[PDB]
Scaffold this active site. Structure first.
Site, PDB file in Angstrom:
ATOM      1  N   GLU A  65      47.366  36.770  67.433  1.00 12.91           N
ATOM      2  CA  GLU A  65      47.100  36.329  66.066  1.00 12.91           C
ATOM      3  C   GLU A  65      45.873  37.007  65.467  1.00 12.91           C
ATOM      4  O   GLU A  65      45.877  37.367  64.280  1.00 12.91           O
ATOM      5  CB  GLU A  65      46.935  34.810  66.028  1.00 12.91           C
ATOM      6  CG  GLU A  65      48.225  34.078  66.222  1.00 12.91           C
ATOM      7  CD  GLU A  65      49.097  34.087  64.955  1.00 12.91           C
ATOM      8  OE1 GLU A  65      48.625  34.607  63.910  1.00 12.91           O
ATOM      9  OE2 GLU A  65      50.254  33.579  65.002  1.00 12.91           O
ATOM     10  N   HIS A  98      49.549  39.384  63.537  1.00 15.63           N
ATOM     11  CA  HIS A  98      49.836  38.416  62.481  1.00 15.63           C
ATOM     12  C   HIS A  98      50.851  38.976  61.488  1.00 15.63           C
ATOM     13  O   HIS A  98      50.664  40.070  60.955  1.00 15.63           O
ATOM     14  CB  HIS A  98      48.521  38.070  61.772  1.00 15.63           C
ATOM     15  CG  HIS A  98      48.593  36.884  60.859  1.00 15.63           C
ATOM     16  ND1 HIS A  98      48.729  35.590  61.319  1.00 15.63           N
ATOM     17  CD2 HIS A  98      48.501  36.795  59.511  1.00 15.63           C
ATOM     18  CE1 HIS A  98      48.745  34.758  60.294  1.00 15.63           C
ATOM     19  NE2 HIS A  98      48.603  35.462  59.187  1.00 15.63           N
ATOM     20  N   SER A 158      51.429  32.123  57.393  1.00 18.17           N
ATOM     21  CA  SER A 158      49.999  32.306  57.076  1.00 18.17           C
ATOM     22  C   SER A 158      49.639  31.341  55.950  1.00 18.17           C
ATOM     23  O   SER A 158      49.827  30.126  56.130  1.00 18.17           O
ATOM     24  CB  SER A 158      49.738  33.795  56.803  1.00 18.17           C
ATOM     25  OG  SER A 158      48.416  34.087  56.353  1.00 18.17           O
TER      26      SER A 158
HETATM   27  C1  LIG Z   1      38.386  43.318  50.250  1.00 12.64           C
HETATM   28  O1  LIG Z   1      37.527  42.946  51.283  1.00 12.64           O
HETATM   29  C2  LIG Z   1      38.228  42.239  52.254  1.00 12.64           C
HETATM   30  C3  LIG Z   1      39.634  42.337  52.269  1.00 12.64           C
HETATM   31  C4  LIG Z   1      40.382  41.619  53.236  1.00 12.64           C
HETATM   32  C5  LIG Z   1      39.744  40.840  54.170  1.00 12.64           C
HETATM   33  C6  LIG Z   1      38.285  40.748  54.154  1.00 12.64           C
HETATM   34  C7  LIG Z   1      37.559  41.439  53.202  1.00 12.64           C
HETATM   35  O2  LIG Z   1      36.179  41.362  53.159  1.00 12.64           O
HETATM   36  C8  LIG Z   1      35.617  40.374  54.055  1.00 12.64           C
HETATM   37  C9  LIG Z   1      40.832  40.188  55.096  1.00 12.64           C
HETATM   38  O3  LIG Z   1      40.594  39.492  56.025  1.00 12.64           O
HETATM   39  C10 LIG Z   1      42.206  40.570  54.582  1.00 12.64           C
HETATM   40  C11 LIG Z   1      43.185  41.146  55.708  1.00 12.64           C
HETATM   41  C12 LIG Z   1      44.543  40.353  55.790  1.00 12.64           C
HETATM   42  F1  LIG Z   1      43.810  39.174  55.592  1.00 12.64           F
HETATM   43  C13 LIG Z   1      44.786  40.734  57.152  1.00 12.64           C
HETATM   44  C14 LIG Z   1      46.283  41.011  57.318  1.00 12.64           C
HETATM   45  N1  LIG Z   1      47.034  41.076  56.041  1.00 12.64           N
HETATM   46  C15 LIG Z   1      48.221  41.411  56.129  1.00 12.64           C
HETATM   47  C16 LIG Z   1      49.260  40.286  55.709  1.00 12.64           C
HETATM   48  C17 LIG Z   1      49.480  40.053  54.339  1.00 12.64           C
HETATM   49  C18 LIG Z   1      50.404  39.040  53.935  1.00 12.64           C
HETATM   50  C19 LIG Z   1      51.097  38.272  54.867  1.00 12.64           C
HETATM   51  C20 LIG Z   1      50.895  38.490  56.230  1.00 12.64           C
HETATM   52  C21 LIG Z   1      49.971  39.508  56.652  1.00 12.64           C
HETATM   53  F2  LIG Z   1      49.805  39.681  57.979  1.00 12.64           F
HETATM   54  C22 LIG Z   1      46.363  41.862  55.035  1.00 12.64           C
HETATM   55  C23 LIG Z   1      45.075  41.140  54.661  1.00 12.64           C
HETATM   56  C24 LIG Z   1      41.941  41.552  53.477  1.00 12.64           C
END
Ligand SMILES: COc1cc2c(cc1OC)C(=O)[C@H](CC1(F)CCN(Cc3ccccc3F)CC1)C2
Ligand SMILES: *[C@@H]1O[C@H](CO[C@@H]2O[C@@H](C)[C@@H](O)[C@@H](O)[C@@H]2O)[C@@H](O[C@@H]2O[C@H](CO)[C@@H](O)[C@H](O)[C@H]2NC(C)=O)[C@H](O)[C@H]1NC(C)=O
Ligand SMILES: *[C@@H]1O[C@H](CO[C@@H]2O[C@@H](C)[C@@H](O)[C@@H](O)[C@@H]2O)[C@@H](O[C@@H]2O[C@H](CO)[C@@H](O)[C@H](O)[C@H]2NC(C)=O)[C@H](O)[C@H]1NC(C)=O
Ligand SMILES: COc1cc2c(cc1OC)C(=O)[C@H](CC1(F)CCN(Cc3ccccc3F)CC1)C2
Lengths: 528, 526
Positions: free
Chosen positions: A325, A438, A200
Site C-alpha cells: 500500500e 496502491h 482510496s
Molecule cells: C503536488 O505536490 C504533491 C502531490 C502529490 C502528493 C504530495 C504532494 O506534496 C506533498 C501525493 O501524495 C499524491 C500522490 C498520489 F497521492 C499517489 C498515487 N496516486 C495515484 C492514484 C490516483 C488515483 C487513484 C489511485 C491512485 F493510486 C497519484 C497521487 C500527489
C-alpha cells in the site's frame, strides 16, 4: 434509430450509445446531468438538483472533469498519466454515467455505483481504468459512476458559515445516489439492491456514506478498496479546515467569512488549484489539503467515533488492500526515493522519511514508529529500510485504518469479507520494488484485461473474470462466494483471502502485530 | 603440621585444611577475618580492617552467614532451600575464603574472586553450589570468595548522614579486594591477574566495581552472569533510599539522623529482617528493599550514565544470561503462578502480572509493555501468555540491562564475550515450564557435577569441565578460547554463543528487538 439507446428520466429524454466489448454489445449513457452546474455564485455551495430539460440530451460521450491538480511528477509516464484528466477541466462537471446490458434489461438488475478515488483532490469517471463495459457484459449488472467536486471546490470549508459549509463534494455523491433511486429503473436497474464500491478516497467516501444517516437509505451494500473513512488523511477538524481555507485565500490575494468566500468566487478555478498543496502544514506524503470536515452535519462525530458506536446488523461489506500500500506514495517526497533507481535509502533518509510519512505526530510518537519498524539486527540495511518505510506509510494510512473498520464492523453485527490483492500486473510500468502498488487492483475489478488491444496474459484475463465474479456475487447476495470458500472476517479469527492467479488461500490477521501499534497504542500516546 | 596448610598474611598466621576432590587435593583457607565485626556501634557503618592478631587463626570451616531473610516460599523444597543459609546467621560475618592448589603454586597464579548473588538481601560464600574445590583442582587457579553484608545491615542508607552512609556492603567487597591485593601472593596467587565474577546481585556488584575508580585498581577482568549494575533493581536513588530507611524505622518503633540510626542500632538483627519486605512501595517481583544507592560517592552517577560515559579500553569482559531469566521470579508474586501446577494464566492475570513485573511505571508505559509482548493473533492463549510474562520480567530486569552494558562496553574500548546458557540440569527440581531458570548455570561453572555424591550425567560432567575451562581461560588470557571459536561481541554484529551439551554455536543479537524497546524507547517514554 435504436430505441434501446433512448431513455426518459425524470428530467427529460436521453440518447445513449452502443459500446463493443469482446463478448458482446453494451448500452451506455454517458454525461447525464444530475445537478445544476456549480458555477459562479454556486461555487462552494451544496448541489441543486438538475432542472428538467426539453429536447434530447446527448449522452454518447463522457463529460468534463472537475477542476483538479494534474500530476506532473513524471511527465508523459503512463504510470502517472493513466490517472490524469482525459477530458477538459470545467466547473460544469456534475454528470454521471450509466452502463447497462444490451438490450436493456427488462427486469430489475442489481446496481453497482462506483465512487472514484484521488485523495479528494483529483479523479474522474472517464478514466480508462474505470470503463464499465466489461463488468456490465460479463456480469449483467447495471453500473453507475458519477463525477463529484474535488479539491477546494468540493471540500473547502469555513465551518459554520453559510457560504462555504464543507463536504459539498460528498453531497454531490449523495445526490447522484438519490438520482439513482428515482431513475435507475428507467434503465433496468433495481433501486432496492444498490452496492457502493470505491477505492482510496472513494472507499473513504463509501464509508462516510455508511456513517451518515441521510445517505444510508440510498444503498444496501458497500465495497471499500484500499481506503476507509477513519484514515488519518480522510478527514480534518474544523480548526484546521479553517486555517487551510484562510491560507488559501491569502495565497491568491483575498482578505468575516462572507467577504472571504466572496473574493474566492471571483478567482479563476485554476488559480485555486495552483496554490492547493501550499496550505498543507508540513512536508508530507499521503496528506491532502481539502478533505471532508467533521462539523456535526454530514458527520455528527469523527468516523472513528461513529464506527465504535454503530449498530451494523444487516450490513454486508467487502474490504481489502493491496500488498504494498505505501510504496507508491514514497516517490512524492520521501528523501532518496525515485521510480528510476532502486531507492536503497540510508538510515538517515529512513529516519527523515518517517517524519514525512507520519506528519504532525510528536517526536515521541515518531520515535515509537522507528522502534517498531526497525530490524535491530539489521538497522541500516538499505533494502530493509526501503520496505520498512513503505510499510510505515501503508500501515498508517490504509491497512490499519481498514483493519480497524473491518474489526469494528464485524464485532458490531456486519458480515465482512476481507482480501489482500497480491498480483503484480504484467503490464505494470512502475519499478519492480514497488511490488503491487496502491490502485493497481482496479483494472482487474473492472475487467480491463479482457480488452484485446492491451497486453495482458491469458492467465490474467481469467484472474480478472474471477474477480468480477466475486464482486458481482457480493452485489447480488452480500456474499462473494459462488454457490475453496472465502470466509467472513471476524474480530477473533481475523480471516482474509489472498487474491492472485493461484486459487483462494485463507489467512489470518491483516498485519495484526503492526496494527496493534497504530490502532491500540499510538492513540493512547497522543492523548498524553 | 603440613606447611602447605600454614600461611602468614599481614594480620597474622593461618591454619588451612586440605580438601579432597575426585581429581586430587586442594588447600583451603575458609573463614579468614578481613574486617572487624560490624556489630553494636559498627552496625550500618563502613567496614574497618581486621586489627592484626597473635597466634594462628584456624581457617578450617565457613564462618557465619550475614543476617538475612530466609526464603520460606516452599519449605523443604530443594529448589528454594539450596540458596538458604547453611551456617548460622550472625552480624559477625566478614570473613573470606581462599582455595589454592595442593601443593601451593611456586609461580604466581591467576586469581578468580567470586561475589555471590541473592538480590542484595541474601546469600553466603558457604553455599554448596559455590564450592571452590573443583575449579581450583581442575584449572589450577586461586579462587577467593568473600561474605559481604546484605539487607539493611549492608545497604540501608540515610544518604548524607555519617551514621548510615549506605553502600557499606559494597565496601565490604572492596575491602576483600584490597585484602586480595596485599595477601593473595602468600597463597601463591598473582595480585596482577585478578578476575571478578559473580551472578545476579553478584554481577551487578562486579559492574559497580568497574564504574567506581577506587575499586577499578583491584582487578583486571570481569565476568557478569545474569546481572548488570544498570538493571532497574540494582540501584535506588537517594530519595527513595531515605524513604525506605525511614519507613523501616517507623515500623520497628524508631522516631535527626543520628538519633534515628542510634535507635535502629538497639534492635535485634532479626527485628529488622522481619520488616524488610514491607518498605517496598509496590507489589512487585524482582525488587529488593535495600540495594546500592547512587549518592555521588561509590557511584558518582547512575550506572547507566557512567557506562554511557566510560572509557573501557584495556578491559576484557565475559557476560551472559540463562535461557529463561524471568520464569523463576513469577512464583513469588505473579497471579496464577505456582511451581506446583502448569501456570497457564488468563489474559486478566497476564495484565495483572505485567504491573507486578514492571512496577513503578506509568499506565502508558505498562500499556506499551502489553503491546510488545502480546501475540495479537493469539491474544488469550494461556501458554503464550505464560512465556510472555516470563520474557517481560526476564528482559526488563536481566537480559536487556546486560545487553546494553555489553553493547556500550564493546563500543567504548573493551573486549567482550557473551553467552546464553541453554542447558537444563538433569537434577533441577523446578517445573519444566520454567526452562533454564535464573541461577542454574552456577553449579556448572563451579564444577559441582564432578562431586561423585551427586546425580549428574556423564555428559553434564564433560560440559562442566568445558565451562570451567572457558572461565579459567578467560581469567588467564582475557579470552575464553585456547589454541569452534567464540567470537567477541560487538555493537554491530552482536555475536554470542550457546552453552549446552552440543558444541559452541554462534548466534546473533541478545533479544535485540525486545531490548530496543527497553533500552531505547521506554526511557524516552518515562
Ligand atoms: C503536488 O505536490 C504533491 C502531490 C502529490 C502528493 C504530495 C504532494 O506534496 C506533498 C501525493 O501524495 C499524491 C500522490 C498520489 F497521492 C499517489 C498515487 N496516486 C495515484 C492514484 C490516483 C488515483 C487513484 C489511485 C491512485 F493510486 C497519484 C497521487 C500527489
Ligand atoms: C535515486 O534517485 C534519487 C532521486 O534523484 C533523482 O533521480 C535520480 C534518478 C537522478 O536523476 C537524480 O539526479 C535526481 O535528482 C536520489 O536522491 C537524490 O540524490 C541527489 C544527489 O544526486 C540529491 O540532490 C537529491 O536531493 C536526492 N533526491 C531525493 C528525493 O532525496 C537517490 O540518491 C537515488 N538512489 C540511489 C542512487 O541509490
Ligand atoms: C496454579 O496454582 C495457583 C496457585 O494456587 C496455589 O497452588 C496450587 C497448587 C493450589 O494448592 C492452590 O490451592 C494454591 O493456592 C493457582 O492460583 C490460585 O488460585 C486460587 C484458587 O484456587 C486463588 O485463591 C489464589 O489467589 C491463586 N493464587 C495466585 C498466586 O494467583 C492457579 O489457579 C493454578 N493454575 C491452574 C490450576 O491452572
Ligand atoms: C517475601 O516476599 C518476597 C520474596 C522474594 C521475592 C519477592 C517477594 O515479594 C515481592 C523475589 O522476587 C525473590 C526470589 C529470587 F527473586 C528468586 C530466588 N532466588 C534465588 C537465587 C539466589 C542467588 C542467586 C540466584 C538465585 F536464583 C533469590 C530471590 C524472593
Amino acid at each position: 434509430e435504436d430505441a434501446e439507446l433512448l431513455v426518459t428520466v425524470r428530467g427529460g429524454r436521453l440518447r445513449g450509445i452502443r459500446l463493443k466489448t469482446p463478448g458482446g454489445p453494451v448500452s451506455a449513457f454517458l454525461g447525464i446531468p444530475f445537478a445544476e452546474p456549480p458555477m459562479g455564485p454556486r461555487r462552494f455551495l451544496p448541489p441543486e438538483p438538475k432542472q428538467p430539460w426539453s429536447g434530447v440530451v446527448d449522452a454518447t460521450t463522457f463529460q468534463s472533469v472537475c477542476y483538479q491538480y494534474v500530476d506532473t511528477l513524471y511527465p508523459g509516464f503512463e504510470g502517472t498519466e493513466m490517472w490524469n484528466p482525459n477530458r477538459e477541466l470545467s466547473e460544469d462537471c456534475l454528470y454521471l454515467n450509466v452502463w447497462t446490458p444490451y438490450p436493456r434489461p427488462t427486469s430489475p438488475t442489481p446496481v453497482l455505483v462506483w465512487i472514484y478515488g484521488g485523495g479528494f483532490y483529483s479523479g474522474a469517471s472517464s478514466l480508462d481504468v474505470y470503463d464499465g463495459r466489461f463488468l456490465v457484459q460479463a456480469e449483467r449488472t447495471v453500473l453507475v459512476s458519477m463525477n463529484y467536486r474535488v479539491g477546494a471546490f468540493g471540500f473547502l470549508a469555513l465551518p459554520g458559515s453559510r457560504e462555504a459549509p464543507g463536504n459539498v463534494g460528498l453531497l454531490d455523491q449523495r445526490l447522484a445516489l438519490q438520482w439513482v433511486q428515482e431513475n435507475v429503473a428507467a434503465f433496468g436497474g433495481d433501486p432496492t439492491s444498490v452496492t457502493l464500491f470505491g477505492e482510496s478516497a472513494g472507499a473513504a467516501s463509501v464509508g462516510m456514506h455508511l456513517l451518515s444517516p441521510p445517505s444510508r437509505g440510498l444503498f444496501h451494500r458497500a465495497v471499500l478498496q484500499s481506503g476507509a473513512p477513519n484514515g488519518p488523511w480522510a478527514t480534518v477538524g474544523m480548526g484546521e479546515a479553517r486555517r487551510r481555507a484562510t491560507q488559501l485565500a491569502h495565497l491568491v490575494g483575498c482578505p468575516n467569512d462572507t467577504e472571504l468566500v466572496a473574493c474566492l468566487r471571483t478567482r479563476p478555478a485554476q488559480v485555486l488549484v495552483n496554490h492547493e498543496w501550499h496550505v498543507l502544514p508540513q512536508e508530507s506524503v499521503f496528506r491532502f489539503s481539502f478533505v471532508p470536515v467533521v462539523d456535526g452535519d454530514f458527520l455528527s462525530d469523527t468516523p472513528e467515533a461513529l464506527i465504535n458506536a454503530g449498530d451494523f446488523h444487516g450490513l454486508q461489506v467487502l474490504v481489502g488492500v493491496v500488498k504494498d500500500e505505501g510504496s507508491y506514495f514514497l516517490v512524492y517526497g520521501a528523501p532518496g526515493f525515485s521510480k528510476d533507481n532502486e531507492s536503497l535509502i540510508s538510515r538517515a533518509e529512513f529516519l527523515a522519511g518517517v517524519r514525512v510519512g507520519v506528519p504532525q505526530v510528536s517526536d515521541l510518537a515518531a520515535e515509537a514508529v522507528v522502534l517498531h519498524y526497525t530490524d535491530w539486527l539489521h538497522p541500516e540495511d538499505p533494502a530493509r529500510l526501503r520496505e520498512a518505510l513503505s510499510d510505515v506509510v501503508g500501515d498508517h494510512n490504509v491497512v490499519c485504518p481498514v483493519a480497524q473498520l473491518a474489526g469494528r464492523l464485524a464485532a458490531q453485527g456486519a458480515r465482512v469479507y476481507a482480501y489482500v490483492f497480491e498480483h503484480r500486473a504484467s503490464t505494470l510500468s512502475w519499478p519492480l520494488w514497488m511490488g503491487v502498488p496502491h490502485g493497481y487492483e482496479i483494472e482487474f475489478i473492472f475487467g480491463i484485461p479482457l480488452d484485446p488491444s492491451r497486453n495482458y496474459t491469458a492467465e490474467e484475463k481469467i484472474f480478472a473474470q474471477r474477480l468480477m465474479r466475486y464482486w458481482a456475487n457480493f452485489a447480488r447476495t452480500g456474499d462473494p462466494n459462488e454457490p475453496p470458500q472465502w470466509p467472513p472476517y471476524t474480530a477473533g479469527a481475523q480471516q482474509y483471502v489472498s487474491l492472485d492467479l493461484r486459487p483462494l488461500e485463507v489467512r489470518r490477521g491483516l498485519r495484526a502485530q503492526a496494527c496493534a501499534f497504530w490502532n491500540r497504542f499510538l492513540p493512547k500516546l497522543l492523548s498524553a
